[PDB]
Amino acid sequence: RGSIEIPLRDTDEVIELDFDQLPEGDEVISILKQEHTQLHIWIALALEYYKQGKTEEFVKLLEAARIDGNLDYRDHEKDQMTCLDTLAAYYVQQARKEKNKDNKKDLITQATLLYTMADKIIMYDQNHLLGRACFCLLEGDKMDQADAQFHFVLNQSPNNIPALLGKACISFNKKDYRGALAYYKKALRTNPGCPAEVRLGMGHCFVKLNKLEKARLAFSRALELNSKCVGALVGLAVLELNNKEADSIKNGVQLLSRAYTIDPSNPMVLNHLANHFFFKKDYSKVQHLALHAFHNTEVEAMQAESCYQLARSFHVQEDYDQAFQYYYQATQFASSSFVLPFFGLGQMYIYRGDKENASQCFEKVLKAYPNNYETMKILGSLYAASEDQEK
């Protein structure tokens, strides 16, 4: 709990230390090794380091536990494999939230080495398949392999809900919301323990297929259990961005000023504060926030929009030189995202008299849907002169 007993050589279970203070993780490996304590107290003290909200000590104290596997513990290999399972799962869990001094491969290469050593004692267990399945999400390929590895946890011993939730994340990547929604229902019936608000992924899939009555009812429960999560708040901002004539204060203050003060390192709320300030003619903060909404993101969906806000703020200032390269990056990063970057490059290629390519970039605007504003774009930039029925 907060003060557990540590076994000794003579008269064990007589010493207790308080877990409220933050001691050094360097003396713990020595104090648990000069007295020969059982392997169970190692994981017992690791969980008390993870309950105080500290992801580094939990993964660092369990790293040196491979050396003292079975010294004199009389056949205690089971707890050794349970120890190395954390070193084969929290590495992939921590590779997604990287900092500014480490890369992705620096936590991938440590997640690949110790997983093979974890399977020397026991192979193909309730969590060992989780590592083989989640190895594919980090590289962005082999989705069928990850789905076939996630299904095996149902056939071995499915004694938890996130043992099955892994298939729905793979169903989401193949654009299958019907297969994903049926798997996200089992996450709320048992409602197991997870600080990440497992109802958040269900409210994320209730965004599609016209279930606006369901996704808000998912985000509200996520905001009532813990208001620390911004992933349940920015969704309601995105659910409310369409109403520009109604509910503007909630959409600039309660959904944009609250998500920003609680979590300023988020490029989604920074992009939305930028596009909200763009209509109020305050360009001094759009370009300041869009630079911070750009360098911390990795996937190509947010960065094309972060460059698009910058080039939109530069076009209205008669600054097309800097905005042209941002419009090119918006389409070079993520092309099948939305119609906005193609239209921005269409109105941009007009400059310098290179209106030839504005037609090629505007051709893909009609392919999604026509617009009364896009019709006058190619009409103004019409290169058809005479006996030219192609144009």
Curated annotation (Swiss-Prot):
Subcellular location as annotated: Nucleus speckle
Tissues expressing this chain: Widely expressed.
TPR repeat windows: 39-73, 127-160, 161-194, 196-229, 233-266, 304-337, 339-372
Segment forming the signal sequence: none
Function: Component of the PAF1 complex (PAF1C) which has multiple functions during transcription by RNA polymerase II and is implicated in regulation of development and maintenance of embryonic stem cell pluripotency. PAF1C associates with RNA polymerase II through interaction with POLR2A CTD non-phosphorylated and 'Ser-2'- and 'Ser-5'-phosphorylated forms and is involved in transcriptional elongation, acting both independently and synergistically with TCEA1 and in cooperation with the DSIF complex and HTATSF1. PAF1C is required for transcription of Hox and Wnt target genes.
Subunit structure as annotated in this protein's UniProt entry: Component of the PAF1 complex, which consists of CDC73, PAF1, LEO1, CTR9, RTF1 and SKIC8. The PAF1 complex interacts with PHF5A. Interacts with KMT2A/MLL1. Interacts with STAT3. Interacts with SETD5. Interacts with ERCC6. (Microbial infection) The PAF1 complex interacts with Zika virus French Polynesia 10087PF/2013 non-structural protein 5/NS5. The interaction with viral NS5 proteins may reduce the antiviral immune response by inhibiting the recruitment of the PAF1 complex to interferon-stimulated genes, thus preventing their transcription.
Name listed for the protein in its UniProt record: RNA polymerase-associated protein CTR9 homolog
